[PDB]
């Protein structure tokens, strides 16, 4: 009477599924996407960052962003009823509270989406490997948008939910962290690139070693959760790649566990690296390379050339990307290559 | 099946939001003439935490 009627209404068949997980997902997901659209349409960044980042201020799709709060806010939650805005929606939109709105809602919407994957798999009666593969974007979101500012000064040093703000975030991690030299980052790059490489090779060879090309092509009945895996031959693909590459799969199960395994691991190792970079525990320098650079001043690798480029990124982007520090760098202290 | 009760009144509701100048007052976005004050080249960044609302409404009397 109380509970099983609501449970049978939620798990009922419909256009969209809305389980017990949908009550957490759909308000949080709808409000995160809507807060991003109403922030890039109307909300400025002038009082936090000193920038114009909305369509109302005359920006395109690339240069809009719902920017991070100011550095004097710290790691404050910035609630609408909180002690900073105090119910004022104008001052809440001006102080950067829309960023914390979108970030906390994206967190609970990702929680509700992975609960939705567990619920649909608990219905269909399958193993929930999609919710295990969705553990990697959740770990990337938690390590980047939550753990990295919580280890830094405040919410100001975080990705500011735009396209060009994301490109600024990549240049900031190159300049201030030397994040390309991090081995956890390199495992992340290798996981993503091996996944895309695995994606293209697998698609290329299922579409090639098909059972019926076109000549006696009896179109058999196809079901969608087999993801069309009846239609190709394992033996022809193993015979191809044992002679081309010298190594090939002979399982349809280990091949697809490998496609599950590679970019989730890649994405989990880059999460570990950004969690280390939250405390500025980065992989900046090789110490004996610094000693060899100090020993003779005619020693130059590509790494010591990269350190001067990170020095240039730092000292030229720093008075504008961090305007709360009030950096007054004269032209004589700025690093130039002809100096 | 067919639904034509009010589509284009929402378009004028969106047009009169921006053209009258209501969205600048609701979302706190400054007007394009109203970025800086009439004498100073400073950016009004919030420097406090619990005085930040009074800092922004202290800046908005300079206009």
């Amino acid at each position: 009477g109380w509970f099983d009627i609501l449970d049978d209404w939620l798990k009922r068949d419909r256009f969209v599924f809305v389980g017990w997980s949908g009550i957490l997902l759909f308000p949080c997901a709808y409000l995160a996407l809507g807060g991003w659209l109403t922030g890039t349409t109307f909300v400025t960044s002038w009082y936090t960052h000193g920038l114009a980042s909305s369509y109302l201020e005359g920006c395109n799709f690339l240069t809009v962003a719902v920017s991070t709060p100011a550095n004097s806010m710290g790691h404050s939650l910035l609630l609408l009823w909180g002690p900073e805005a105090q119910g004022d929606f104008t001052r809440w939109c001006q102080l950067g509270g829309l960023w914390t709105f979108i970030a906390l809602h994206g967190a609970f919407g990702l929680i509700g989406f992975m609960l939705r994957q567990f619920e649909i798999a608990r219905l269909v009666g399958v193993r929930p490997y999609n919710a295990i593969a969705f553990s990697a974007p959740i770990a990337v979101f938690v390590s980047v948008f939550l753990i990295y500012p919580l280890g830094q000064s405040s919410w100001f040093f975080a990705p500011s939910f735009g396209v060009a703000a994301i490109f600024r975030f990549l240049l900031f991690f190159q300049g201030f962290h030397n994040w390309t030299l991090n081995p956890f980052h390199m495992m992340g790059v290798a996981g993503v690139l091996g996944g895309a490489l695995l994606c293209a090779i697998h698609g290329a060879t299922v579409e090639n070693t098909l059972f019926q090309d076109g000549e006696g092509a009896s179109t058999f009945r196809a079901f969608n959760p087999t993801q069309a895996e009846e239609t190709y031959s394992m033996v022809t693909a193993n015979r191809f790649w044992s002679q081309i590459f010298g190594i090939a799969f002979s399982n349809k199960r280990w091949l697809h566990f490998f496609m599950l395994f590679v970019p989730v691991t890649g994405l989990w190792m880059s999460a570990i690296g950004v969690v280390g970079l939250a405390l500025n525990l980065r992989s900046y320098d090789f110490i004996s390379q610094e000693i060899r650079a100090a020993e003779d001043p005619e020693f130059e690798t590509f790494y010591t050339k990269n350190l001067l480029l990170n020095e240039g990124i730092r000292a030229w982007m720093a008075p504008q990307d961090q305007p709360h520090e009030n950096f007054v760098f004269p032209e004589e202290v700025l690093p130039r290559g002809n100096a | 099946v067919i639904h034509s009760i009010t589509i284009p009144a929402l378009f004028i509701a969106g047009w009169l939001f921006v053209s009258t100048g209501l969205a600048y007052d609701v979302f706190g976005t400054p007007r394009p003439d109203s970025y800086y004050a009439q004498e100073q080249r400073s950016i009004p960044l919030v420097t406090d935490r619990f005085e930040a609302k009074q800092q922004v409404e202290t800046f908005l009397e300079q206009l």
């Binding site: 369509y55 | 639904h3 921006v18």
Partner: peptide, 28 residues
């Protein structure tokens, strides 16, 4: 009560925001 909210929670601020964006081009 039905999936008619998909038009009442996703098409109404969409048409409102396209009206705002089409008003935004005729500024200055």
């Amino acid at each position: 009560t039905v999936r008619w909210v998909a038009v009442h929670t996703l098409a109404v601020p969409t048409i409102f925001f396209l009206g705002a964006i089409a008003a935004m081009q005729f500024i200055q």
